[PDB]
């Protein structure tokens, strides 16, 4: 998809940089309970390397890396909703969809756009879930259970 829009940009000849916000999962390795997000999005650091390797991709595509923290939806997380308060008791922040949306737009501001043009920007939008000492073997499973 990135390659596709890179071709169009190169063929139709634009120097305009497409800013691709990479929906990174928050803080890989410090959670064992997600089961999906944590592992899959760690190769985005390797994907930032591909852009840092390939030379002609710079003008067409800029990589903006965003780590999307705990964010409460109703459908998937309807089990996780009750313990949102519990996890937040560790001095950590869980986000509403409107809050996280606002965090994503701020990366789309002119200030952070130009920053992405000079070099890949990795943004931690997590609420401090990284230094979390909360054991996922319990407080996640039990929450789900």
């Amino acid at each position: 998809l990135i390659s596709g829009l890179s071709k169009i940009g190169a063929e139709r000849d634009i120097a305009s940089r497409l800013h691709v916000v990479l929906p990174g999962s928050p803080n890989r390795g410090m959670f064992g309970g997600d089961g999906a997000y944590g592992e899959a999005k760690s190769a985005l650091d390797a994907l930032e390397n591909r852009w840092s390797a390939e030379k002609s991709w710079a003008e067409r595509v800029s990589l903006a890396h965003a780590l999307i923290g705990w964010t409460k939806g109703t459908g998937l997380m309807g089990q996780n909703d009750a313990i949102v308060s519990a996890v937040e008791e560790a001095g950590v922040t869980t986000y509403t969809t409107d809050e996280m949306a606002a965090m994503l737009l701020d990366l789309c501001t002119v200030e952070t756009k130009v920053a992405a043009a000079g070099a890949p920007v990795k943004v931690d939008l997590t609420g401090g879930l990284g230094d979390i000492k909360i054991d996922m073997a319990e407080l996640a499973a039990k929450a789900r259970e």
Binding site: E11, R12, D13, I14, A15, S16, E59
Partner: protein, 393 residues
């Protein structure tokens, strides 16, 4: 040749074969891609609709290749690549006298005298295109109170002095603006810009003057030109372009390749650096760098001549924007110089591929009417006549 005959994929066949053509295109295409973020190759190869550039946004419902900021660039590169191939085959003669029509003049100097780099040529030409868009007032719809119109004085008994007269009268009479913009062919082609009502009133006059007109003969209105350029209205924006030229056109250049070979537009007579010539420029175009040089010609010391030619060349190109292009005199001048220098066989070759039939057909009809003297002359076109150019047959 000038703008307007440009076609999609023009001279693209030559690029696939000739090595000289590739070097001209690629060096040009690389610069444009890095600096302005776009490729002329793509524009020429397949015609797009809208394009966004560095600071500017160009949209056309038909094609961008037909947009002047591009079109001029395409036309200039097409011809510059074709001549380079002709030069590689050595077919270029050492004594060739060269000239160009409007935007083609920049390519003329580029090919024969090498007055700028391939990237340098496409800079001036691109900016000259972008300069032509913002010069004249528009409406909300982009409407213009002015336009251009192509005159043919023939089919009736009318002369160049008769056309000039009738135009000058209706210009003073109505109080509107009517200017003869282009002198192209003696009794054949003339271009006129000014107020639309003036263009209409002038159309009306010849329809009345010509006894046989039921169809509005001899008058063709020009689609797409909203600017009364090459009239007295455009003289403001020269100083900025005059500086732009001096930046892209440095002082290390060949004086001889230009002198006697090159026929400016603003100045219908061949380039030579002389107190006589520089004065003719000043008369047609009053200017500060020129009027001083004329004041003291006693600067005779040998450091000057190249430095003089370098500014005179730029003065002609910068104010070419303002002064009417004289193609009639350009053609007739060639006759004047030959006749005094001998009339023996001449070959007239037009370059730029598909733009080649135009000013040749302009020459052809001109070779007929005044030139009836029965001379051996060869009209050759890069597009059409290529087998004759490279002599292969």
């Amino acid at each position: 040749p000038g703008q307007g005959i440009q076609h999609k994929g023009m001279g693209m066949e030559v690029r696939a074969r000739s090595k000289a053509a590739r070097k001209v295109w690629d060096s040009a295409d690389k610069f444009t891609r890095e600096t302005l973020g776009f490729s002329v190759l793509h524009v020429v190869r397949d015609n797009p609709t809208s394009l966004i550039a560095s600071g500017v946004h160009y949209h056309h419902p038909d094609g961008v290749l037909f947009l002047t900021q591009f079109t001029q660039v395409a036309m200039a590169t097409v011809a510059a690549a074709q001549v380079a191939e002709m030069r590689e085959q050595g077919a270029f003669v050492e004594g060739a006298i060269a000239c160009g029509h409007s935007v083609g003049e920049y390519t003329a100097l580029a090919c024969v005298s090498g007055v700028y780099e391939l990237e340098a040529l496409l800079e001036v030409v691109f900016h000259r295109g972008s300069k032509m868009h913002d010069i004249v007032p528009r409406d909300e719809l982009g409407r213009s109170n002015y336009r251009l119109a192509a005159i043919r004085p023939s089919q009736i008994d009318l002369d160049d002095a008769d056309v000039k007269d009738f135009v000058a009268e209706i210009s003073e009479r109505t109080g509107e603006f009517l200017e003869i913009v282009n002198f192209n062919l003696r009794g054949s082609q003339y271009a006129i810009a000014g107020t639309v009502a003036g263009l209409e009133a002038l159309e009306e006059e010849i329809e009345r003057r010509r006894q046989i007109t039921g169809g509005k003969r001899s008058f063709i209105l020009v689609p797409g030109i909203d600017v009364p350029f090459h009239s007295s209205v455009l003289r403001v924006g020269v100083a900025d372009f005059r500086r732009s030229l001096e930046r892209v056109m440095p002082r290390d250049k060949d004086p001889e390749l230009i002198i006697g070979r090159y026929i400016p537009n603003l100045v219908p007579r061949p380039f030579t650096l002389d107190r006589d010539f520089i004065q003719e420029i000043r008369d047609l175009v009053p200017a500060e760098p020129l009027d001083e040089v004329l004041a003291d010609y006693d600067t005779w010391r040998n450091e000057k001549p190249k430095e003089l030619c370098r500014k005179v060349v730029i003065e002609l190109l910068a104010w070419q924007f303002a002064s009417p292009v004289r193609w009639i005199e350009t053609q007739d001048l060639l006759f004047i110089e030959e006749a005094a220098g001998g009339l023996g066989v001449e070959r007239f070759v037009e370059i730029g591929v598909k733009s080649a039939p135009t000013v040749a057909g302009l020459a052809t009809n001109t070779l007929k009417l005044p030139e009836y003297s029965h001379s051996t002359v060869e009209v050759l076109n890069s597009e059409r006549d290529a087998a004759v150019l490279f002599a292969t047959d």
